[PDB]
Design a protein around this ligand. Structure first.
Ligand SMILES: NC(=O)C1=CN([C@@H]2O[C@H](COP(=O)(O)OP(=O)(O)OC[C@H]3O[C@@H](n4cnc5c(N)ncnc54)[C@H](OP(=O)(O)O)[C@@H]3O)[C@@H](O)[C@H]2O)C=CC1
Ligand SMILES: NC(=O)C1=CN([C@@H]2O[C@H](COP(=O)(O)OP(=O)(O)OC[C@H]3O[C@@H](n4cnc5c(N)ncnc54)[C@H](OP(=O)(O)O)[C@@H]3O)[C@@H](O)[C@H]2O)C=CC1
Ligand SMILES: NC(=O)C1=CN([C@@H]2O[C@H](COP(=O)(O)OP(=O)(O)OC[C@H]3O[C@@H](n4cnc5c(N)ncnc54)[C@H](OP(=O)(O)O)[C@@H]3O)[C@@H](O)[C@H]2O)C=CC1
Ligand SMILES: NC(=O)C1=CN([C@@H]2O[C@H](COP(=O)(O)OP(=O)(O)OC[C@H]3O[C@@H](n4cnc5c(N)ncnc54)[C@H](OP(=O)(O)O)[C@@H]3O)[C@@H](O)[C@H]2O)C=CC1
Ligand SMILES: CN(Cc1cnc2nc(N)nc(N)c2n1)c1ccc(C(=O)N[C@@H](CCC(=O)O)C(=O)O)cc1
Ligand SMILES: CN(Cc1cnc2nc(N)nc(N)c2n1)c1ccc(C(=O)N[C@@H](CCC(=O)O)C(=O)O)cc1
Ligand SMILES: CN(Cc1cnc2nc(N)nc(N)c2n1)c1ccc(C(=O)N[C@@H](CCC(=O)O)C(=O)O)cc1
Ligand SMILES: CN(Cc1cnc2nc(N)nc(N)c2n1)c1ccc(C(=O)N[C@@H](CCC(=O)O)C(=O)O)cc1
Lengths: 247, 247, 247, 247
């Protein structure tokens, strides 16, 4: 049985990824930072389906003196619990505005660049050094049309895109595939008022609806499968045509 | 049972795609131009497995006065035979050099632009007007790094990518998804000497091997499946990292 | 004194380019199809400032059995009149909708693909075989966000983008540079009502104004200058941040 | 008279840029880190040409508790010395390998990301808050074909690209243009043995030669000039077609 590590796999999309992989024979490591309770409910639920098929792992992925070691332990966790790690899904991501013109800015680049870019880099490094192996990074189809006010987040995601291709090429000799899935509009913020959410959905050309977590899980499932054995360094966009819409 | 049209489906990649879709309940129309024998052997072979599950259709897709009528009939064939058409795979493609510096150039653009770009347009146009509907175009991942001497072929493939995105947006309201699969190095020319073939394969970062028709068919099968129901206007690269390699 | 061919150079952007290059010592060949009067006035106005520094040349760039010969004569015209041709600006371009769902379609593809892609190809080809040489193609920055209903036009421009990169690479050894300028929103349709025009200008991030013909011509002048002597195969976007705006 | 800040402007490309801008009537703030000698010879040399036209400024741009204030002072330096800052050229850049498979990695990500992305972000942020204003970031045309072993540098530059577009959109209302120039093969490492250097030059399609520093300054001078008044959010590639070369 192959093992997979899902960062931020406690809720939403990450939760759907952890479940999907598990439904396919994967033993999963569910990482989280604060959604400890949601994490436990998922792990328990998975082990109830298959004893010893799911473990928990807590860790902050922000830039810090402890980030490099934290990433080392998160991967080490897969080996301690399952003796192996075949799949890494970089789903954990900090997301909020940081307007150029008027929490500290320094602390923002630390949390935004850490979770969306640097942690993934440290995780892949650790994953590759301890070795159907594949990595799947979660990108954002919309970063090409920068969301006003999310400057730092945009840079972070662009950097992650550079990591997907840079890693893809260096790990090819090691037979490790590195790809990405780029959602456009998926699960909306839970606090966001319905009328606002409805103004967002109406923008999606294909069905005027956001992508469900399961549809995103589907794409990831395809990329980790043997049906994508020749695919590496590619980004799979899942945005219902949203990026194609003219302003 | 859904029906699928596959242009240039008698041999190589088209053949593999036709077999893959058929194994999934699809009633396929095999289109061909010169490979009449191969087409008959494929249809017979397919019907043998399920009576009335395959039909044949001949037609040149080069630019001409007849192209528009020809593409209408090719789609009409699916309806006459199965009363429906749910999937269209634009696979047919002419491919040969057209060096800028020293068969008539006019006739070359007629054949290269017709099969790679204009017929697909007319086919999509007919497919949409006669309506899990989806179209899949066979692109080329290496066209961003122009193969010297294949200028016209390259322009055609770029037009095709343009069609993939324009059609995806115009057809979203009609619930028809339009995507593309972009091979990098797949089935090599049968007449190319083995040593030259070996020099080409050695360039592939992931395994130093070309993609098998089945690995290309896998990606395609994924894009027509319900697991891609939210995917439209995207190009799935299947090149084992080739496009990432620095000269 | 160097010579420059500007296709569709009788009015609008083409007109502005002919004047800029002329004010720089260039001897221009003003090509046109229907704008015979405008071409005569422009040529006279330029010869007035410098005798024998401008010539006229009529020719349809739609797909045809004559296209190839026409393109040969258009380049030959510059040699007949100036004994040389250093710069080719592919500005001529047909533009109008071709909706997938309901003038013959065949005639529309002949004109859109002819002027936007095939002619430029034959022109570049002729330009090269008869040789600071450089070619500048007029692309469209907004084609990445397909304008609903302009499907054929969009494909043509993508083909033109492919030609820019393919020609640049093939012609590097011949010391001929090949670049492109991609306007976003520039000279609006003269018949478009003011309010509609005002709605379009509002969409531009940088100044809520469209690009003036002179600003497009400035970019063109730079790429043909020696200050761009190491620049080939690149596309210079001049859209005032329009392509960055989210829908 | 306008003032321009040039990071890493003591030698090579940065030096060429400072001179060019100075030759156009610009008052320049020459920033450096260790090239203290070259910085002083450049500034005196420029002050000899025009008294009080050039000032010096030393600083490190790696991630740190002090980075934010260091960037603030570098911009402030322009106002103290000239009471204004119109142009900002982000040239400074750390460059070296960081192989995924076997100086600390944490330290490397701090210097590579700080100088190539984060510092630029704080400079732009400082430059905008204190306000023909434009920013020019130095990118890398080859980052799309990741150089094996430069994983971190590649991510840093990708992030720089996201910043160029993010900033360009957010600062359009403030009338500040943000663009980028992306060299391919320019000045080789001074310690690199000639034969290696020759092997690198041979790969350049246009002339088989690297871009001189002047050719790069030309592109930058153009983007800062009024001849690019409508250009923002764009990346100008200057690689002699190197990026088009198929491996
Ligand atoms: N949803 C959408 O519409 C879109 C999503 N995406 C991308 O898809 C992925 C999943 O998105 P979505 O489910 O909405 O994400 P969320 O923002 O809901 O969750 C991200 C998860 O990662 C965790 N996390 C955030 N910051 C850190 C940190 N510094 N260290 C460790 N963990 C952290 C969260 O905390 P905790 O574990 O405490 O709960 C959370 O569970 C992301 O990478 C996102 O960028 C892209 C486009 C659209
Ligand atoms: N093979 C590779 O390495 C790569 C392939 N691709 C793309 O994948 C797709 C499949 O490739 P591959 O199987 O090698 O293709 P082939 O070139 O082998 O076959 C194309 C097929 O389409 C048919 N065809 C060609 N011209 C015309 C025309 N004018 N009118 C009608 N039919 C025509 C052929 O004729 P007939 O039916 O008479 O035999 C042929 O069977 C193509 O779109 C190709 O561009 C992209 C990158 C790499
Ligand atoms: N204006 C804008 O807002 C934008 C323009 N662009 C691009 O910039 C370039 C210049 O644009 P613009 O000035 O508006 O273009 P126009 O559409 O006004 O003019 C194109 C010119 O080329 C000629 N032409 C059109 N079809 C043919 C043909 N089949 N054969 C010969 N000549 C033909 C015209 O005919 P005739 O000589 O008979 O008058 C016309 O003078 C174009 O390539 C356009 O695609 C891109 C984005 C935006
Ligand atoms: N040269 C080429 O072939 C290519 C260059 N480029 C890009 O063009 C730009 C200029 O390139 P090039 O002149 O070769 O660059 P160099 O690497 O020669 O110089 C970068 C400059 O910035 C300074 N610097 C380096 N690290 C730091 C740091 N951590 N903090 C502050 N300053 C630092 C240097 O130190 P000091 O002041 O001590 O001398 C140096 O003056 C760069 O952004 C580069 O990425 C892109 C492709 C190719
Ligand atoms: C598509 N998306 C949903 C969403 C949900 N969680 C995520 N989580 C992460 N990590 N990354 C994402 N891209 C992400 N995206 C979006 C896009 C824009 C805005 C946005 O404009 N937000 C404003 C609020 C807008 C309003 O309600 O008026 C803000 O101030 O944050 C919110 C969610
Ligand atoms: C990846 N590919 C295989 C291949 C085979 N059939 C195809 N068929 C079509 N429709 N489209 C393709 N892209 C295609 N590609 C290639 C790539 C380069 C050359 C090439 O350079 N060909 C030289 C021959 C090179 C040699 O053997 O010396 C030629 O003149 O045709 C051939 C096939
Ligand atoms: C940016 N642009 C200006 C412009 C004018 N002449 C050109 N000429 C050429 N050859 N190419 C262009 N891209 C071009 N574009 C545009 C963009 C959209 C529409 C457009 O949607 N037109 C509708 C009319 C919109 C309306 O007024 O309601 C049409 O049906 O033609 C027109 C001009
Ligand atoms: C194009 N380029 C020149 C060069 C010089 N200084 C720079 N400085 C910065 N800031 N950024 C750059 N991109 C840059 N590029 C390159 C590209 C690759 C290698 C490279 O492969 N370097 C090997 C040496 C290769 C060898 O000689 O064997 C190394 O280990 O450093 C060197 C220079």
């Amino acid at each position: 049985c192959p093992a997979a590590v899902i960062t931020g796999g406690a809720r939403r999309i990450g939760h759907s990824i952890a479940v999907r992989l598990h439904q396919q024979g994967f033993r999963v490591v569910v990482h989280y930072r604060h959604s400890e309770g949601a994490a436990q409910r998922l792990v328990a639920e998975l082990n109830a389906a298959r004893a010893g098929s799911a473990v928990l792992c807590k860790g902050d992925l922000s830039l810090s003196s402890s980030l490099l070691d934290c990433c080392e332990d998160i991967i080490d966790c897969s080996f301690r619990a399952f003796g192996r790690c075949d799949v890494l899904v970089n789903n954990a991501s900090a997301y909020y505005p940081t307007p150029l013109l008027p929490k500290p800015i320094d602390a923002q680049v630390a949390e935004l660049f850490g979770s969306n870019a640097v942690a993934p880099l440290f995780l892949i490094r650790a994953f590759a050094r301890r070795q159907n192996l594949s990595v799947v990074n979660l990108c954002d189809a919309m970063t090409d049309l920068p969301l006003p006010g999310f400057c730092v987040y945009t840079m972070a995601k662009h950097a992650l895109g550079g990591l997907t291709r840079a890693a893809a090429l260096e790990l090819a000799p090691r037979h490790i595939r590195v790809n990405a899935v780029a959602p456009g509009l998926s699960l909306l913020p839970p606090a966001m008022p319905q009328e606002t959410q409805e103004e967002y959905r109406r923008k999606v050309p294909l069905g005027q609806s956001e992508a469900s977590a399961a549809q995103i899980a589907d794409a990831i499932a395809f990329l980790v499968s043997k049906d994508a054995g020749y695919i590496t360094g590619t980004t799979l966009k899942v945005d219902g045509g949203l990026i194609l819409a003219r302003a």
